[PDB]
Each structure stands twice: as C-alpha cells, then as structure tokens.
Amino acid sequence: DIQMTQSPSSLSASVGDTVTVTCRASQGIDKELSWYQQKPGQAPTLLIYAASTLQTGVSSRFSGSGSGTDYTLTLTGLQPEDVATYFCLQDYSTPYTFGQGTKVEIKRTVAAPSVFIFPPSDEQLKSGTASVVCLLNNFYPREAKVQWKVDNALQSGNSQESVTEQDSKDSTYSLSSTLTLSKADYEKHKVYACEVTHQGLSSPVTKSFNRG
Amino acid sequence: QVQLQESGPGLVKASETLSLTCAVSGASINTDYWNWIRQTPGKGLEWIGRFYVPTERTEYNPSFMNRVTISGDTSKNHFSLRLTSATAADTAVYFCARGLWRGYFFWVDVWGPGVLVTVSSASTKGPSVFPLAPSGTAALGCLVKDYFPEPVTVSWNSGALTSGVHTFPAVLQSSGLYSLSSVVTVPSSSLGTQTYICNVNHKPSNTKVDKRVEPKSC
Ligand code: NA
Ligand code: NA
Ligand code: NA
Ligand code: NA
Ligand code: NA
Ligand code: NA
C-alpha cells in the first residue's frame, strides 16, 4: 500500500498570504497525485491532477509541484472564500489512498458577537422540558466564554455548546449555547441570563429574560 | 451540467447490508469510471472501489475484504453500492464520484454531495421543532430537538430566505438523540409583516416538519 502523510493538519493565514500544503508518499509515485478542495458542509472539488496539471476552470492561484515522494499544493492570494480542507490523493497504486487533509483557516480583524437569548417554547414546556438558547452571531476570534446564570447564580452542567465553521464571506463564527432543564426546575427560578465574554466587547455582555 | 446525486441518508441496522445508489445526470456511465468513497472525521477519506460499466470490471479496496460490490444500470444511468454485514465502523458520509483515466493518471473530477449513513441497533425518531421567538436587527430560529439519526436539512421559507442563516452542527444529548438549532437575523422592521417558517427535513425518518416562528405575546 501507499501511505500519504499530509502536513500541516491545520493552518491559519491572513488574506492575501501564500499558503503551502505538503503530502509525502511512502515511496515514489511518479506524479500520480491529485489535490482537492472541500469547503465546509460541501463535497470535495477537483483542483489539480497529475501532481501539477491545473483543472480547466480552477483559479490560477492554485499551483501544484512535486516529484518522487514529496508534493506541494500552493495557494496564493488567499481570500476568505478559500476557507476549506485540502486533501491529496495518490493514484499510483490501488487501493487509492488520501492524505489526512489540511484545514485552512483565515485570520481577520476582531469582530464582536451580537448576543441574543431565547426563552423556551410554550409548546415544549407543555411536554415537560425547557430549553433556553443563547446565540453569539458573527464574531472573531473563535475563542469565547458563555456562562449561564439563573437568579444571577452561576449555573454549570446543564448546557452544551455548538459552533459553526468559519464563514466563507466575512470569516466569522457563530455559537449556540443551549441550557436544558426540566419544567419543574425551570419554574423554580425567575431570571435567566447569558453572560458573554469576548475579545471584541468592552465588557461582558449579559442578555436575560424573566419567566413571566 | 454533469451532476451526481447519492441516495437519501438513512439508518442501517447492525449486521444488515448498506445499500446506496448514485443518479448521474449530464454524462453517460458507459464511459469513464465510477467510484464510491466514504469520509469520517478520524479516518479521513477512504476509497472503496471503482467500476467500469462497458466491461463490468470492478476493483475494490482490499480493506473491505469481500463485503462490497458495485454494479450499474446503463439505461437508468445509475450505479450502486452494497456493503454487507454493516457495522458501527461503517457510519460515514458516502460519496459517489466519477473518475477519469488518461494515460497513467487517474483523478476524481466530479463528486456527489455525499450522504450520511448511520449504522445503529436503535430506531429512527423524528424531530420535535420548537420556535426561537425574537426579542434594528432581530434574531429568530428553530430548535430541532430529539431526533435520530443525523442528519436534518433546514431551510427558511422554502429557500426564499438565505442570507443570514446559520444552521449549527448537531449536538449529541445524554438522550442518545441529536439536537440542533437554526437561526436567522432579519430587520426588526419585518417581524410583524413578514412570516418566517423553518422547513426541517429528516430524510432518515422520511419526516418533514414545518414550523412558523412569531414573537410570543401577552
Ligand atoms: Na508500503
Ligand atoms: Na491553526
Ligand atoms: Na411559543
Ligand atoms: Na494513476
Ligand atoms: Na453522526
Ligand atoms: Na441546540
């Protein structure tokens, strides 16, 4: 078998920079390699084949070189649209094998989150459970802290967070924090607040609602 | 417009057989080669096998031993994959993809959108969709809660509303069921006039749920 070792596993770069991804084959593969771009939530698309032949229709900002065991994909003039994971594929010998992929992220100016809080649906509360959601919209950098406070007492253990992939347009992230409670414990308290701390905010932003 | 589309996602019981189909449009499967590839976070991309219709010749990744077979249907422009004795290790996004072979070089020029297949000893369950009621820009969304397996598709107003939509990755609950939210930011001007419905599609369960989101009132 042929083993493809790809590096780096992930990288961060600024708009207009030049980024290079490398795949190393376990032995010479005589340029029988192709590269692919996979944008978030999408399927891979062809970029280069035969190590250095650019697919007609793909931007000239992509370039491929290599011989023997070492092959490179170079991406010049990095744009926000290029946020994706890039893979190699060797067609030298079956079974065809892929590199582990390089996750390419974009560095941009700091952007603060727009914070929103959502109380539980009346529909779900009839079923006996209550979900309170806190939304942090279009912020950068990815790092952020979200702390729940019920009756302004810190709450922990009953929340799970989920974060989107980097936006292809503004290179920002969005985050959801979901606090889930029984209706009984939900009705035990009155104030529900989401305290958010982030680079782009002067001070921690707190959004709250009162039950009733 | 060469296009490829895999069968809809679903659940495959443990030890039973995983079956998928790719519907090809814009090109005849009577030329070039036709592959099945799967993708997992930890294993990356895995080539399963290739298929050449004219001669019905088939080349498989040995790692699948003899669990796999790939066949075609030249008048329907479909080719299929079957993987017997399915196991939790076969949960993955499966891609159908065309492979071109010019001289010594082979590459995958057209991929399908991919379809998630989940191997599980449990049963499907449709999602409960609850509104995320809003309150110069407001935010509203839908809470797609308690469903199995992944995935759910979410649109807004049957695709009319696109800009500003964020469908978050699903979270695994202690329930064993998945839950996610989909949000959209709109002008606060339009909350009382414009209607907002999230179209949730849970293909594993053949369950579509449509829910309108309005500001709660007194
Ligand atoms: Na080897
Ligand atoms: Na990095
Ligand atoms: Na409600
Ligand atoms: Na080859
Ligand atoms: Na999954
Ligand atoms: Na959620």
Nearest residue of chain B to residue A101 (CA atoms): B44
Amino acid at B8: G
Q: Smallest CA–CA separation between B72 and chain A, in Å?
A: 21
Q: Which residues of B touch A43 (CB under 8 A)?
A: 95, 111-114
| Residues B115 and B37 sit within 8 Å (Cβ to Cβ) | no
Q: Which ligand is nearest to the CA of A5?
A: 1
Q: B105 C-alpha vs ligand 1 centroid, how far in Å?
A: 20
Q: Which ligand is nearest to the CA of A3?
A: 1
List residues of chain B with CB under 8 Å from any CB of chain A: 44-47, 59, 61-63, 95, 104-114, 128, 130-133, 137, 139, 141, 143, 145, 166, 168-171, 173, 179-181, 183, 185, 216
Q: Which residues of B touch A174 (CB under 8 A)?
A: 166, 168, 183
Is there a contact between B169 and A164 if contact means CB atoms under 8 Å apart? yes
Q: What DSSP designation does A148 have? A: E
Resolution in A: 2.3
Q: Where are the beta strands (DSSP E) in chain B?
A: 3-6, 10-13, 18-25, 33-40, 44-52, 57-60, 68-73, 78-83, 92-102, 105-111, 115-120, 128-132, 137-147, 153-156, 165-167, 171-172, 178-187, 197-202, 207-212
Is there a contact between B171 and A120 if contact means CB atoms under 8 Å apart? no
| Residues B114 and B48 sit within 8 Å (Cβ to Cβ) | no
Q: B97 C-alpha vs ligand 6 centroid, how far in Å?
A: 33
Show the domains of chain A with their CATH numbers. 1-107 (no CATH), 108-212 (2.60.40.10)
What is the Cα A166 distance to its own chain's centre?
5
Q: Which residues of B touch A100 (CB under 8 A)?
A: 44
Is there a contact between A176 and B44 if contact means CB atoms under 8 Å apart? no
Structural tokens at position B119: 């191997």
| Residues A76 and A67 sit within 8 Å (Cβ to Cβ) | no
Distance CA B34, CA B32 (A): 7
Is there a contact between A178 and B171 if contact means CB atoms under 8 Å apart? yes
Q: Which residues of B touch A94 (CB under 8 A)?
A: 59, 61
Q: Which residues of B touch A123 (CB under 8 A)?
A: 130-131
Q: In chain B, what are the domain boundaries?
A: 1-121, 122-218
Distance CA B81, CA B22 (A): 9
Q: Which residues of B touch A37 (CB under 8 A)?
A: none
Amino acid at B30: N
Contacts of A52 (CB under 8 A, 6+ apart): A31, A63, A64, A65, A66
Q: Smallest CA–CA separation between A141 and chain B, in Å?
A: 17
> Is the alpha carbon torsion for B59, B60, B65, B70 positive or negative?
negative
Q: B171 C-alpha vs ligand 6 centroid, how far in Å?
A: 7
Distance CA A41, CA A174 (A): 15
B154 phi/psi in degrees, rounded to 5: -130, 125
CATH of domain B122-218: 2.60.40.10
B64 phi/psi in degrees, rounded to 5: -90, 15
| Residues B198 and B210 sit within 8 Å (Cβ to Cβ) | yes
| β-sheet bridge partners, residue B11 | B118
Method: X-ray
Q: Smallest CA–CA separation between A127 and chain B, in Å?
A: 11
